[PDB]
Design a protein around this ligand. Structure first.
Ligand SMILES: COc1cc(-c2cncc(-c3ccc(C4CCN(C)CC4)cc3)c2C)cc(OC)c1OC
Ligand SMILES: COc1cc(-c2cncc(-c3ccc(C4CCN(C)CC4)cc3)c2C)cc(OC)c1OC
Ligand SMILES: COc1cc(-c2cncc(-c3ccc(C4CCN(C)CC4)cc3)c2C)cc(OC)c1OC
Length: 284
C-alpha cells in the first residue's frame, strides 16, 4: 500500500509569533497547515498530547487531520493539519460583514455549542475528559459556509499567565486564579466568550443601526496592551465593554447584553456555565 503523504502548500493565510498557517492541498482536498515557530513548539506538544488522549470530533471544533514532526537538515519541523474554512476567522468576517438576528444567533449559539462540548466530561470508552481552552478569542474562531463557527487552537488547552492579554479574565491578570481548581479555567473561558459575544452583537443590525468592528477594550487600552494596562482596566477600575443604548430597542441584543454581563462578573463562581449559555441562546 502507498501512504500518500505529499501536502502541497498553496497560499499563506496567516503569519505571527505562533508561526504560519497555509491553505494546502492533500489529494485534491483543501487542508489548513500550521507550521510552528521554535517559540510556540510547546503548543504543538500540548495539542498533540490532547488529541493522542481524546480524538475530538464536533461540528463546532476545528477538525483535526494530523500532527507531523519532520527532520529538516539541522532542525525539527512541527506541522498541525486541520480542515480548511475558506471564509476565515470570525475576527476577519466581522470586519467587513454585518449580521441579522438569524446569522448573529447562529454564530453565537454554535460557539456556545463548541465550548460546552469542550467543557463537558462524557464518561465511557467513546467519552472525553473536560477541557478548558484558555485562549478563546475571535481570531481563534472560524466561520463555516453553513453560518456556524468552530473553535480552534487547543495549544494552551488543559484536560481534567498564558493566552491573549486583551481577553484575560481579571483573576488571571491579578494572579488570584485558584491554579489547582479545574473549574477556574472553565470560568476564564466564559469571560473570553462574553467578550466575543460583545464583538459579534455590535455587528448585528437593529432599526437601521450597527456599530463598526472593534476589539474588546479598544477605547481604554492601546494596541498590544501590556499586562499592567489590562490589570488596571479589568481588575483595579473593574471596567467592562460598553453596551450601546440601541441594543435595548431589540429583544435579541437585550438578551445578549444580559448574557455578556453574566459572563463578566469579577467573582468567577458567579459567572454562567457554557451549558446554561447554550440553553439561554436556544430560547432567544
Ligand atoms: C503519515 O503521514 C500522513 C499520512 C496520511 C495517510 C495517507 N494515506 C493513507 C493513510 C492511512 C491511514 C490509515 C491506515 C490504516 C488502515 C487500517 N489498518 C488496520 C491500520 C492503518 C492506512 C493508511 C494515511 C494516514 C495522511 C496525512 O495527512 C493528510 C499524513 O500526514 C502528512
Ligand atoms: C488523516 O486524514 C485522512 C485519512 C484518509 C485515509 C486514507 N487511507 C486510509 C484510511 C483509513 C482506512 C481504514 C481505517 C479503519 C477501517 C477499519 N478498521 C477496523 C481499522 C481502521 C482507517 C483509516 C484513511 C482514513 C482519508 C482522508 O480523506 C480523504 C483523510 O483526511 C484528509
Ligand atoms: C486559529 O487557529 C487555526 C486556524 C486555522 C485555519 C483554518 N481554516 C482557515 C483559516 C483561514 C483561512 C483564510 C483566512 C483569511 C486570509 C485571507 N483573507 C483574504 C480572508 C481569509 C483566515 C483564516 C485558518 C487560519 C488552522 C489552524 O491549524 C492548521 C489553526 O491553528 C490551530
Amino acid at each position: 500500500r502507498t501512504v500518500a503523504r505529499d501536502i502541497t502548500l498553496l497560499e499563506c493565510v496567516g503569519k505571527g509569533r505562533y508561526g504560519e498557517v497555509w491553505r494546502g492541498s492533500w489529494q485534491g482536498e483543501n487542508v489548513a497547515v500550521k507550521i510552528f515557530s521554535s517559540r510556540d513548539e510547546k503548543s504543538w506538544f500540548r495539542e498533540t498530547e490532547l488529541y493522542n488522549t481524546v480524538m475530538l470530533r464536533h461540528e463546532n471544533i476545528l477538525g483535526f487531520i494530523a500532527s507531523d514532526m519532520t527532520s529538516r537538515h539541522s532542525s525539527t519541523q512541527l506541522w498541525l493539519i486541520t480542515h480548511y474554512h475558506e471564509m476565515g476567522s470570525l475576527y476577519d468576517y466581522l470586519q467587513l460583514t454585518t449580521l441579522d438576528t438569524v446569522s448573529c444567533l447562529r454564530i453565537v449559539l454554535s460557539i456556545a455549542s463548541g465550548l460546552a462540548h469542550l467543557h463537558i466530561e462524557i464518561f465511557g470508552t467513546q467519552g472525553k475528559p473536560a477541557i478548558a481552552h484558555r485562549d478563546l478569542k475571535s481570531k481563534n474562531i472560524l466561520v463555516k459556509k453553513n453560518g456556524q463557527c468552530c473553535i480552534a487552537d487547543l495549544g494552551l488547552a488543559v484536560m481534567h499567565r498564558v493566552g491573549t492579554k486583551r481577553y484575560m479574565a481579571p483573576e488571571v491578570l491579578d494572579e488570584t486564579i485558584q491554579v489547582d481548581c479545574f473549574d477556574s479555567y472553565k470560568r476564564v473561558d466564559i469571560w473570553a466568550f462574553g467578550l466575543v459575544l460583545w464583538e459579534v452583537a455590535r455587528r448585528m443590525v437593529s432599526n437601521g443601526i450597527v456599530e463598526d468592528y472593534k476589539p474588546p477594550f479598544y477605547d481604554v487600552v492601546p494596541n498590544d496592551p501590556s499586562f499592567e494596562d489590562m490589570r488596571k482596566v479589568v481588575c483595579v477600575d473593574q471596567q467592562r465593554p460598553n453596551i450601546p443604548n440601541r441594543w435595548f430597542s431589540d429583544p435579541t441584543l437585550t438578551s445578549l447584553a444580559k448574557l455578556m454581563k453574566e459572563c463578566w462578573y469579577q467573582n468567577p463562581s458567579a459567572r454562567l456555565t457554557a451549558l446554561r449559555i447554550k440553553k439561554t441562546l436556544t430560547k432567544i
